[PDB]
C-alpha cells in the first residue's frame, strides 16, 4: 500500500528552472488526491481533458509530475495550445493534453532582496519545442551569418537568462511555482488508482 509521492513534489524546498524542468515519474501507488482536491482560491487550478472530481474513480498507467518556476505573466502559457517564450522554448504542453496545471505565488520563497538570479529561462532557440521536450543545451545561439564557435559576440548570444526575482516587483514579475500533472493511459496495466 504505497502512497503516491505528491508531498515530495509540492512541498519541495527548491524547484527547478523552467528550461530544465524536473519530472517525477509516479506509478504503482494509491493516489491520495487531497493536495489538489480542495485548493484555496489563491491557487491557479486549470484541468484539461479530465475532471478533478473524477480522478479518484480512474486508474492510469503513469502519472508525470512536472515542476518548475516562472513569473506570473507567464503562467497563462503553461496550457495546451499556447505560444510564447516559455511555451515555445522551455516547456510545451500538447494540444490534446490530459491533466491539470497548478500554480501559486511563491514570492515569499524564491525572491531575495538582492535578486534571486538562480532561476533561469531560455530566450533563443532555432525552432519550437515539441510537447514534453526538455532542452538543457547551453550552446551559443547563432543569430547572424557568421559561425559563433562558442564566442559571445555580435549575433552570438548565450541562450539562457536569469529571472532576478525581487520582492518589490509587480505580481507579473513575481515567481510562481508550477506543478503540471499528466495522466497517461496507454496499452499497459493501470496502476495509479485513487482512494
Amino acid at each position: 500500500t504505497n502512497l503516491c509521492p505528491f508531498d515530495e513534489v509540492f512541498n519541495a524546498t527548491r524547484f527547478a528552472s523552467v528550461y530544465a524542468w524536473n519530472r517525477k515519474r509516479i506509478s504503482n501507488c494509491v493516489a491520495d488526491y487531497s493536495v489538489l482536491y480542495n485548493l484555496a482560491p489563491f491557487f491557479t487550478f486549470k484541468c484539461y481533458g479530465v475532471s478533478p472530481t473524477k480522478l479518484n474513480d480512474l486508474c492510469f498507467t503513469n502519472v508525470y509530475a512536472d515542476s518548475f518556476v516562472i513569473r506570473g505573466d507567464e503562467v497563462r502559457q503553461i496550457a495546451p495550445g499556447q505560444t510564447g517564450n516559455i511555451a515555445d522554448y522551455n516547456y510545451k504542453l500538447p494540444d490534446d493534453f490530459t491533466g491539470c496545471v497548478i500554480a501559486w505565488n511563491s514570492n515569499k520563497l524564491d525572491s531575495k532582496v538582492s535578486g534571486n538570479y538562480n532561476y533561469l529561462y531560455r530566450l533563443f532557440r532555432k525552432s519550437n519545442l515539441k510537447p514534453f521536450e526538455r532542452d538543457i543545451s547551453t550552446e551559443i545561439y547563432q543569430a547572424g551569418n557568421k559561425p559563433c564557435n562558442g564566442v559571445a559576440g555580435f549575433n552570438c548570444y548565450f541562450p539562457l537568462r536569469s529571472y532576478s526575482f525581487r520582492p518589490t516587483y509587480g505580481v507579473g514579475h513575481q515567481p510562481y511555482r508550477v506543478v503540471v500533472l499528466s495522466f497517461e493511459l496507454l496499452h499497459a496495466p493501470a496502476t495509479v488508482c485513487g482512494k
Partner: antibody, heavy 124, light 105 residues
Framework: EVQLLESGPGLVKPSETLSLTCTVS????????WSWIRQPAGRGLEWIGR???????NYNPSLESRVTMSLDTSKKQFSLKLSSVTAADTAVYYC??????????????????WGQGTMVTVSS | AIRMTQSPSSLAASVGDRVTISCRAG??????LHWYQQKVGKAPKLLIY???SLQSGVPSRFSGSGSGTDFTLTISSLQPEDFAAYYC?????????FGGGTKVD
C-alpha cells in the same frame, strides 16, 4: 577547465579605491555566477558579492555602500571596486565561480572554481 | 546576517582517528550548508554541499549531516592529507556567511 586569475594593486593608500580584476579562461561566462571573497589575516572567509552574466548583483550589506562589481564579457573579465579603503580591507581576495548545475539546478551555490587569490595591503 | 558557529575552533588528532566538527546556524537554513577544506597556503576546496552530498572526488571517509540549525562534518578515519582548516558556509539567505573555521592539527 575554467581558470580564474586575480589582478590589481598589491598595495593601496587609505581612502583610495581598490580595483581588482579576475580574468576567466577555459569556459562560457554565461553558465556561472561570479563572486568575490576576502580573507583578512587571522579571520575566516568573508563573501563580498555575486554577479550574473544578466547584470544582476547581490552584495554583503556591510560592504554594499563601498562595493561595485562589473562584468566585461568581451575581455572575459569581472572586476571589484572598493571605495574608501581602510586597514581592515587588508586581506587575500579570491575570485570564485559557482558550478553550472544541470539536474541539480542552475547556479548551485557551491564555489567549485577558485582563483589563487591576491594579497591586497592597505598602507602608506 | 545568519550567524554560523563552529565547534571546536581547533582540535589535535592522530591518523586513523574519527574527527567530528559541529556547525550551528542562528536560524533554520534547511539543507543550504556547504563544507570547505582549506590547506595551509591554499584556497578553500568544496567538500560537501547541501549538508550531506559529497563533492566529486571527495573520499567517502568524509560525511556531512544535519538540517535546520544543526550540522556536522565527520571524518571517519583521519589521513595525513586531511590536516587542514574546515569551514561551514550557509547559502540560504544573503549575506552568505562562514563559520569561524575548525583547525584539525
Amino acid at each position: 577547465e575554467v581558470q580564474l586569475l586575480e589582478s590589481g594593486p598589491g598595495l593601496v593608500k587609505p581612502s583610495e579605491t581598490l580595483s581588482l580584476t579576475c580574468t576567466v579562461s577555459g569556459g562560457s561566462i554565461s553558465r556561472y555566477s561570479w563572486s568575490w571573497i576576502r580573507q583578512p589575516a587571522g579571520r575566516g572567509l568573508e563573501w563580498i558579492g555575486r554577479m550574473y552574466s544578466s547584470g544582476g548583483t547581490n552584495y554583503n550589506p556591510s560592504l554594499e555602500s563601498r562595493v561595485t562589481m562589473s562584468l566585461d564579457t568581451s575581455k572575459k573579465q569581472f572586476s571589484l571596486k572598493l571605495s574608501s579603503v581602510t586597514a581592515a580591507d587588508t586581506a587575500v581576495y579570491y575570485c570564485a565561480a559557482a558550478s553550472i548545475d544541470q539536474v541539480w539546478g542552475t547556479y548551485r551555490d557551491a564555489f567549485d572554481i577558485w582563483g589563487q587569490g591576491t594579497m591586497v595591503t592597505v598602507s602608506s | 546576517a545568519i550567524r554560523m558557529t563552529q565547534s571546536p575552533s581547533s582540535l589535535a588528532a592522530s591518523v586513523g582517528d574519527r574527527v567530528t566538527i559541529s556547525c550551528r546556524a542562528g536560524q533554520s537554513i534547511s539543507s543550504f550548508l556547504h563544507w570547505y577544506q582549506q590547506k595551509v597556503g591554499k584556497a578553500p576546496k568544496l567538500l560537501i554541499y547541501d549538508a550531506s552530498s559529497l563533492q566529486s572526488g571527495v573520499p567517502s571517509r568524509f560525511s556531512g549531516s544535519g538540517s535546520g540549525t544543526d550540522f556536522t562534518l565527520t571524518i571517519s578515519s583521519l589521513q595525513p592529507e586531511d590536516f587542514a582548516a574546515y569551514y561551514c558556509q550557509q547559502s540560504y539567505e544573503n549575506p552568505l556567511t562562514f563559520g569561524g573555521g575548525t583547525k584539525v592539527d
